[model samples]
Target chain A: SGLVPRGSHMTPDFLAIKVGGSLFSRKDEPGSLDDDAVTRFARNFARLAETYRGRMVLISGGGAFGHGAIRDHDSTHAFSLAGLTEATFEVKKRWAEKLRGIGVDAFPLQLAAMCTLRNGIPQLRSEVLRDVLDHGALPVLAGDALFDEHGKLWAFSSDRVPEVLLPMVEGRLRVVTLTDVDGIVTDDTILPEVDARSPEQAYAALWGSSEWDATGAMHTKLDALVTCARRGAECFIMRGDPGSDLEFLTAPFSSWPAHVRSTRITTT
Target chain B: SGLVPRGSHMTPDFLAIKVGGSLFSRKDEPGSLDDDAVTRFARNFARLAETYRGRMVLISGGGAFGHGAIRDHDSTHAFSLAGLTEATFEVKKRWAEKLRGIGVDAFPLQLAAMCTLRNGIPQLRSEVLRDVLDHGALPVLAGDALFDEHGKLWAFSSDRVPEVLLPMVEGRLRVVTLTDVDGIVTDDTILPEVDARSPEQAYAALWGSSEWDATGAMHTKLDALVTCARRGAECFIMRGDPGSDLEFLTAPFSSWPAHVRSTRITTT
Candidate 1:
């Protein structure tokens, strides 16, 4: 049979966009998704990536899906790990699915399904995603929960998802980083503290724009922010988590939302 | 905090639709997908399922995804099981995500991630998919390749996906069965065998209509077709695979391509 291998028709070039998991569900309700947010993001992301169609890889966060499940399990101090992993797949898969309804070919994936950890070392299962990419479909990846070589829990995160694929890709890649939070802040700048003093107050402060460190070690999350910025694409330390009202991706990147808080890191 | 659990928002009445994996890719090309086929299916499936919205569970087949991977491995006479599982995820997950982009809230899932076989005894992990459901999203499941309790290859098929969930669901369910093949034939029909003597000839035969049993045991595949028909739905042993050039789905069922070849199963 002259059937060529999958992705035979295309080259290995691809673009990557990271959609924070937190963007899908509400901050208040950390488990189920925010429908409005999902719809808004779906339209825009599809709008943004469709032009690049079949040449993009979407890296998604665990969001309320992963975090919520883990948090729920923590309440009991022990929901079976199986439940946690299952919940992660359910939510993350949904995030990818939502993007699919758009004309874009949304190919959702759980990171663990593609890569594994060598103890603490990470290894991408396949050298390249040509087959998925060449067809001009988008491959969506989400941070997933998995066990280690010894079967101990090792969660592969969305922030860390792309770097593992770097070795397989050629040239400096375009990474469109979107977060649920109103842009990740650098410690270099100090702004007011904001959290749910009240739901209204909390959101008010959030929308008002405050500067603070996002979760996890700054170096850990910022590594790619800086590196991908240095290599290619302006690092968008922007907030589009729920991907609510935003103006950049509508045609030409004009009419910037000066009001929405964000960072634009140009290459050094 | 008066936070409600995810699915607390709904009743359990959900419609189930099975999309055979064969529909996404080409009949000749076993690995990658056919672009046009996917788009046509997405629009109609979206049109069909969106009305039901939060109350539907879309069960998908492995299609060329699983079969192609497994076939590729057989060619070399050996390939890692890891590769096989990864390829299956790529195709099936793509199928689910394509539906999601349609605004139907597609939550793609690999069956192995949600359930496991206790040495051939299928156990659904957390019970119901209400968390995903009550949230008004669709849960898409694909037959995944996994091992027995002892770790031997046991592929969970799409046809068999719903039965395991039966123990957890209530009431007689509405199952819409769509196959890649024109329609599943029963032992009752005696017609000409048609396959690729030539692409044109084969499809001409296929479209003109012929009769023969589809792959696997009729008892195996038709189990759901007959039962779901008896329980609910017309058991549309119909072809939406590649979902090409078809009408009935555009609006009303008035102009079915009665020539398109299918079976309308009623309760015996």
Candidate 2:
């Protein structure tokens, strides 16, 4: 085909993989994009997409493009439609450029414009994403700047995507979010799963030491997973370090390499 | 720059060019994307962008990417969020992939999701576009499906964009619409201009014999230009047929080639 093909085929239930923005860029450095990490992930991304093309959807943290702009801009801290919109454009460009350079043909989906916040809860045109996946695309979403019904800028992230997606891909959805840590941990002890029978311990550890996650990002991530799990999705918070990243993303839970570690949240 | 650059230094006032979808593919043929036309346009597009980067914003009619999908789908004519969203994604992909292929760097903007129609009038986040333009990229908008507040699709064409953009880019905004026709004509005579002072004759002819522009597309084009002109934008309805296309786009209206003819709509 003359057109650069992005999506492979189609599938019923899909996996929502959020490649942590932390992995693609160093949080220590402002506005820096890791060319190396982007390359490695792009390699694995293309492979997984080929092996599980239609069955996958991807998301990424704002990285330098998002967080940097948001933090640095007075426009975001207060509210400047122009500044917030500018940040959104910057992050999207970063994602599209890096990923487009790194590997795998992908479509950058814009949802912030289609989204609104009701008391900070996101309401987006989820169908736009559903239709893109249905059309054989490795539908990719960016964590963009969102505004409330009153035009106030709301801090939105990929963490909230599952919530937006829960109702649409209700049954058999899997959410795998990659982060810097191995998984939710308490003093080097990795928590394998969190929910129902496994809930208290994970929450205790997270709630107790949730200091560094001062911004409530960790809370947001775990909460979204638990919420998705409660609604019948199989969810996990793991690092995108391959071997583990590869196993978790490509294989079923039972077959994941034993050494692979993550906090899986699911229902019985 | 690790990131691809599509926009150049900013200008106070920008030029908006509507690249007719007709130039890209045969309207009669369904679902065909002309590799040649796409390549040619991409070349000219990048060239113009380099020559006129930050100041130029490009818009295209739905060519096959838009019209084909829109016409063939039952969702658009009626309103199926799934169907309309799907078509929107499809057209967007076509735009991103094709342009990403043909020339300079471009960002595929999403506005439909950000828009709401009240009584068929579009209320979009104009600031988002302004921000993207300011961020230094050739901000490209697709002629995608727009929904009313009720979630029903409204037939939105790039022709209607000037109206949406009028307020955003008020003074010093110049709109040049490209089409297959040499110029607006009557008995082989091309009308050099149309507006308040030069009014009646052009309207008598246009309002008198407006047809085959069936579905009011031609009327919409003229009307939008006039409306924009009234609001202080220099508008030209011309063909992107080069020499003329090249000159009109790169130079000021005062220096348009003597042979070049178009329907120019301006205000006092």
Q: For every model shown, what is its TM-score relative to the native structure?
A: 0.44, 0.55
Model number with the top DockQ: 2
Q: Give lDDT: candidate 1, residue B204.
A: 27
**DockQ of predictions, in order shown:** 0.03, 0.09
Over 4 Å off, model 2: A1-12, A75-77, A81-85, A88-103, A196-198, A207-215, A242-248, B1-109, B112-268
**Model 1 alpha-carbon drift over 4 Å, by segment:** A1-14, A27-30, A74-79, A180-220, A224-234, A241-261, A264-267, B1-216, B219-268
Q: Where is model 1 chain B poorest over a 10-residue stretch in terms of lDDT?
A: B190-199
lDDT of 2 by residue, B1-268 (tens): 1331111121226577787777766655766666666666656666666665556677767665455555554542243222333333444445444554544445556656445466877766434455445445565665555655554556677777767776665436777888877667765688887774456666666543333221255666777778777766777888774323353466666665678768888775
True-vs-predicted CA distance for residue A45, candidate 2, Å: 1.4
> Candidate 1, residues B211-253: lDDT per residue as tens digits?
3222342344555555444433334555665545433432222
lDDT at B205 for candidate 1? 24
Against the native chain B, each candidate's TM-score is: 0.67, 0.80
